[PDB]
Nucleic acid binder design. Structure first.
Ligand SMILES: O=C(O)CCC(=O)C(=O)O
Ligand SMILES: [Mn+2]
Length: 201
DNA sequence: AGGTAAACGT
DNA sequence: AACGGTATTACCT
């Protein structure tokens, strides 16, 4: 297995993917993708949006899970039932049957886009897993340990692959290497990732 | 005290 | 281009 408390479910979301993608488009029609600017002033290469009660955002003074889209000043769109259902099935298969996400971060990767090694650790209740769904073009996912310099595993994540981490591995560093250009029948020229969290109480 | 931002050179 | 420095600090609460 990937790590203690972590698993990859290869092609788990393959059958659900078309509906998931129609739903990504619906969410982005209300809260559009945007490349966020870090506190340090750099524009991220990944374009993002959110759905559910809480959305990950940067602001000048740090990061924040907020109920309001700072670009539209309206609540993030509701989490699509398709998203919620897939998440629940994936979490159950991964051994986390009780997971209730309240936040879905939607990442869009154009060629060259990356996410440098980081930890998901600003959720108040770290008991809950992360469920991470890959769609479209393939990407190299890095998955390490509690320390930034712990040895990395590098795993190709393909369309429909779902990765779940929690328990002992909940705070592990992970990231995405710059996306290779290519074609996919469903997304054409990009990769999407759906990241489900319980971000509030 | 402790939290936490982080996305260039070799 | 895989690995690691940087936050080895400057601020908040
Ligand atoms: O795109 C991925 O596979 C990972 C995304 C991620 O780590 C995040 O959204 O926090
Ligand atoms: Mn992450």
């Amino acid at each position: 297995p990937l790590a203690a408390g972590a698993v990859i479910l290869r092609r788990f979301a393959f059958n659900a993917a078309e509906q998931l993608i129609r739903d990504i488009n619906d969410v982005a029609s209300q809260s559009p993708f945007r490349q966020m600017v870090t506190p340090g002033g750099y524009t991220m290469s990944v374009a993002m949006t959110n759905c559910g009660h809480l959305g990950w955002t940067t602001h000048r003074q740090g990061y924040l899970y907020s109920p309001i889209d700072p670009q539209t000043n309206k609540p993030w769109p509701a989490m699509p039932q398709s998203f919620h259902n897939l998440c629940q099935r994936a979490a159950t298969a991964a051994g986390y049957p009780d997971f209730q996400p309240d936040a879905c971060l939607i990442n869009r990767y154009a060629p060259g886009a990356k996410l440098c090694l980081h930890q998901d650790k600003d959720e108040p209740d770290l008991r809950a897993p992360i469920v991470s769904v890959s769609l479209g073009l393939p990407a190299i996912f890095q998955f390490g340990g509690l320390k930034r310099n712990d040895p990395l595993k590098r795993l190709l994540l393909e369309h429909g692959d779902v990765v779940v981490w929690g328990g002992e591995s909940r705070l592990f560093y992970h990231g995405i290497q710059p996306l290779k250009a290519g074609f996919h029948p469903l997304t054409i020229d990009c990769r999407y990732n759906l990241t489900f969290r319980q971000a509030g109480k």
